């Protein structure tokens, strides 16, 4: 077949509505709308010689694991025995060719002026440059940007409960590890559902939403298996992944390496526990709740979450936490 122009993924009206909503070393994420429905578009340069955001571009083979894992996780919303909507929907993947669309560069510029960017302005790509364009369901706003917007300690418990269940279901279905579940990768969207449903090994349960649906995104470093074929990112030789400081996030990579003996092909669901611990730590230390923590009931929820924080590292997986931890009774 071969690639398609950016205009294929982003016809005039869709392109005009693109706004930048995030970034990483991988490239750029734009929100737009199609058939009256918001979507997020992740654009990753591939196969070219230019350094991008400090790193070499991936080949098509190197980007396949992300695509495969994005598809498997998206599929869980539709399964029976192990079902959850707690990841993100994947709509489509395309291989696109061109220089960066001028309208996306303007959107890039607007973000850089308001939020600041840690990326290079993507204005040096030639007309034959390839990209992978992944279109996802819009999952709302990341937990870091929502750190002053959560209502109450009940909201915090619901988010942790949703995260834990989603991970457990992915563990059970796919021997999944996220491996990079920093707070940019947890999305919150308003829902009018009072409770959310999941199914773990044929058993269905619900979790009070407190008005929010959580989505886990970005499977760049993730791992799973299907048909006893493991799909993963081998970061054994990536030293700078392990040398960060100034946030507990950067200890999580070191602690994962310790757990797995630097062997990233193996299944170690304890990594999901480590990420949950980091998120629980964020809930306790970096959130300013709109209703603060002002009643005996809210204080009690805070105490239960601190207890979770002090105990949860003695569990072996998200599935073990969900099924056995007192917080979820």
């Amino acid at each position: 077949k071969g690639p398609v122009p950016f205009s294929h993924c982003l016809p005039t009206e869709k392109l005009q509505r693109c706004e930048k909503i995030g970034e990483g070393v991988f490239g750029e994420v734009f929100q737009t709308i199609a058939d009256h429905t918001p979507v997020a578009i992740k654009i990753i340069a591939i196969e070219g010689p230019d350094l991008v955001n400090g790193s070499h571009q991936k080949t098509f083979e190197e980007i396949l694991p992300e695509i495969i894992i994005s598809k498997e996780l998206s599929l869980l919303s539709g399964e029976v025995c192990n079902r959850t909507e707690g990841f993100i929907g994947l709509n489509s993947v395309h291989c696109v060719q061109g220089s960066y669309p001028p309208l996306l560069l303007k959107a890039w510029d607007h973000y850089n002026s308001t939020k600041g960017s840690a990326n290079d302005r993507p204005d040096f790509f030639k007309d034959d440059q390839l990209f992978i364009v992944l279109e996802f369901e819009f999952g709302g706003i990341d937990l870091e940007q929502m750190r002053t917007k959560l209502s109450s300690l009940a909201t915090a418990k619901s988010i942790l409960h949703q995260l834990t269940a989603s991970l457990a279901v992915a563990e059970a279905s796919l021997r999944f590890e996220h491996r990079d579940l920093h707070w940019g990768n947890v999305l919150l969207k308003k829902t009018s559902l009072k409770k959310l449903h999941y199914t773990l090994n044929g058993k269905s349960s619900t979790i009070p939403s407190c008005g929010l649906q959580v989505s886990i995104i970005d499977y760049t470093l993730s791992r799973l298996e299907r048909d006893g074929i493991v799909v993963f990112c081998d970061v054994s030789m990536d030293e700078d992944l392990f040398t960060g400081d100034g946030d507990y996030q950067f200890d999580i990579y070191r602690l994962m390496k310790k757990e797995n003996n630097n062997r990233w092909g193996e299944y170690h669901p304890y990594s999901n526990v480590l990420w949950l611990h980091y998120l629980t730590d964020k809930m306790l230390k970096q959130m300013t709740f709109k209703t603060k923590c002002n009643t005996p009931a809210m204080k009690q929820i805070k105490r239960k979450i601190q207890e979770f924080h002090r105990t949860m590292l003695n569990f072996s997986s998200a599935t073990d936490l969900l099924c056995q931890h007192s917080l979820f009774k």
Binding site: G24, V25, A118, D142, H182, N185, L241, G244, F250
Partner: peptide
């Protein structure tokens, strides 16, 4: 937020 630290 980002996987590796970077201003």
């Amino acid at each position: 937020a980002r996987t590796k630290q970077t201003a």
